C-alpha cells in the first residue's frame, strides 16, 4: 500500500480535502489506505469511502457507455480496444472495492448499520461488473449481486426503520438492479413502491434532520417509479 506509511487520521483528513477539491481518485486512494489500516470505519468514513468510489466508477461507467454506443454503431480495432481498456480499468476498480469489502470490512462489521452498508456496496460493485460482463461469468456476477443485496435487505428490515437512509438507498439500488440487470422490471417496481410507501408512513416519527434525509431518497424512488410505470 502506497498509503501504508501515512497516519489513519491524516488519510481521513486528506480524503475530506480531496472531496472539497473534487479529486475523487485521490479521495478513493486515501480511503483505501484508511480501510487497510484494519480498524472499522465510522458512519462518516463509510460515506467517504462510498462517495469516492462511486464518483470514480461513475465516470468510468459513463465513459464505457459512450464508447459502447460508438462501438455498436460501428458494428478498425480502435473503438473496441479503447472500450476494452476503460472496461478493464472499471473492472479493476470494482475488484479493488470488492477486495476491501471481502478483506475484511464485511466480516469485521459488528453492527447491522455497518454490515448493511457494506453489503449494499458489494451488490453495487457486482452490479457494475454485471453491466460490462458478457457470458456465463455474467450470470454468476448477477446472482452474486442479488445475494449481496438480498442479505442486506434481510438485515435492514430486521434492524433499521423503513426511513433509514441506508435502508432506503439499498432498496433504491436493488430496485434498479432488478430493472436494468436482472430483467425483472416487475420486481423493481414492487420494491420501489413498497419501499416508498413504508417510508412515507414512517415520516411522522422523524425529526427535521432525519425527515430531510429520508425524503431525499424517496424522491429518487418516485423518479424511478415515474420512469417505469
Amino acid at each position: 500500500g502506497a498509503m501504508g506509511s501515512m497516519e489513519r487520521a491524516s488519510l481521513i483528513q486528506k480524503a475530506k480535502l480531496a472531496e472539497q477539491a473534487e479529486r475523487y481518485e485521490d479521495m478513493a486512494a486515501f480511503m483505501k489506505g484508511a480501510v487497510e489500516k484494519g480498524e472499522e470505519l465510522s458512519c462518516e468514513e463509510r460515506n467517504l469511502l462510498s462517495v469516492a468510489y462511486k464518483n470514480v466508477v461513475g465516470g468510468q461507467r459513463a465513459a464505457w457507455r459512450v464508447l459502447s454506443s460508438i462501438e455498436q454503431k460501428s458494428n478498425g480495432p480502435e473503438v473496441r480496444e479503447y472500450r476494452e481498456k476503460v472496461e478493464t480499468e472499471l473492472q479493476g476498480v470494482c475488484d479493488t472495492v470488492l477486495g476491501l469489502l471481502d478483506s475484511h470490512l464485511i466480516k469485521e462489521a459488528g453492527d447491522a448499520e455497518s454490515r448493511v452498508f457494506y453489503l449494499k456496496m458489494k451488490g453495487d460493485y457486482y452490479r457494475y461488473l454485471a453491466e460490462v460482463a458478457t457470458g456465463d461469468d455474467k450470470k454468476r456476477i448477477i446472482d452474486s449481486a442479488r445475494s449481496a443485496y438480498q442479505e442486506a435487505m434481510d438485515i435492514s428490515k430486521k434492524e433499521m426503520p423503513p426511513t433509514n437512509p441506508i435502508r432506503l438507498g439499498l432498496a433504491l439500488n436493488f430496485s434498479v438492479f432488478h430493472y436494468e440487470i436482472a430483467n425483472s422490471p416487475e420486481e423493481a417496481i414492487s420494491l420501489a413502491k413498497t419501499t416508498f410507501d413504508e417510508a412515507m408512513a414512517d415520516l411522522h416519527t422523524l425529526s427535521e434532520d432525519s425527515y430531510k434525509d429520508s425524503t431525499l431518497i424517496m424522491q429518487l424512488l418516485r423518479d424511478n417509479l415515474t420512469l417505469w410505470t
Partner: peptide, 5 residues
C-alpha cells in the same frame, strides 16, 4: 438512466 445512491 435511473437514480442510484
Amino acid at each position: 438512466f435511473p437514480a442510484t445512491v
